[PDB]
Curated annotation (Swiss-Prot), chain A:
It comes from the Viruses. Changing residue 49 to W: In strain: Isolate MA20C, Isolate MA20, Isolate MA12. This is Hemagglutinin HA1 chain. It comes from Influenza A virus (strain A/Hong Kong/1/1968 H3N2).
Amino acid sequence: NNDNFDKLYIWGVHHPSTNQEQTSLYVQASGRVTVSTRRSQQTIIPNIGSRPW
Amino acid sequence: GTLEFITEGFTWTGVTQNGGSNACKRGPGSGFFSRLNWLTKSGSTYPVLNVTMP
Ligand SMILES: *[C@@H]1O[C@H](CO)[C@@H](O[C@@H]2O[C@H](CO)[C@@H](O[C@@H]3O[C@H](CO)[C@@H](O)[C@H](OC4O[C@H](CO)[C@@H](O)[C@H](O)[C@@H]4O)[C@@H]3O)[C@H](O)[C@H]2NC(C)=O)[C@H](O)[C@H]1NC(C)=O
């Protein structure tokens, strides 16, 4: 951020319903997403399961 | 303002229900919390459970 203002970044992380779907899309059995700045840090590990339709 | 509990028939297939530990003894033998259900292995399987209740 070389600008003179705060930048807000919206991002997310996908939670598949089945392992089959997890592998179709991202190969690895279990994913992981880690977004970080010099002073903060944040890490989500997607959970696989059925939610309501 | 109430602990009015209503049981529903969840159907937990492929797992053994009603486990309890000697920490939580009910009467002579051993038991568990009354409104919770300790699901453990059956045979040597724990299926991926997937129930729903509208
Ligand atoms: C974990 O349990 C989940 C919870 O029920 C389960 O998902 C259910 O699966 C059925 C699959 O068809 C879906 O039901 C939908 O219901 C709405 C209500 O009106 C319908 O609009 C729609 O109807 C159709 O589906 C028919 C056949 O499957 C088809 O013939 C019709 O043409 C029409 O397309 C939906 O079916 C939901 O996916 C879902 N219900 C709920 C409440 O979540 C899920 O399978 C299970 N997970 C695993 C891994 O087995």
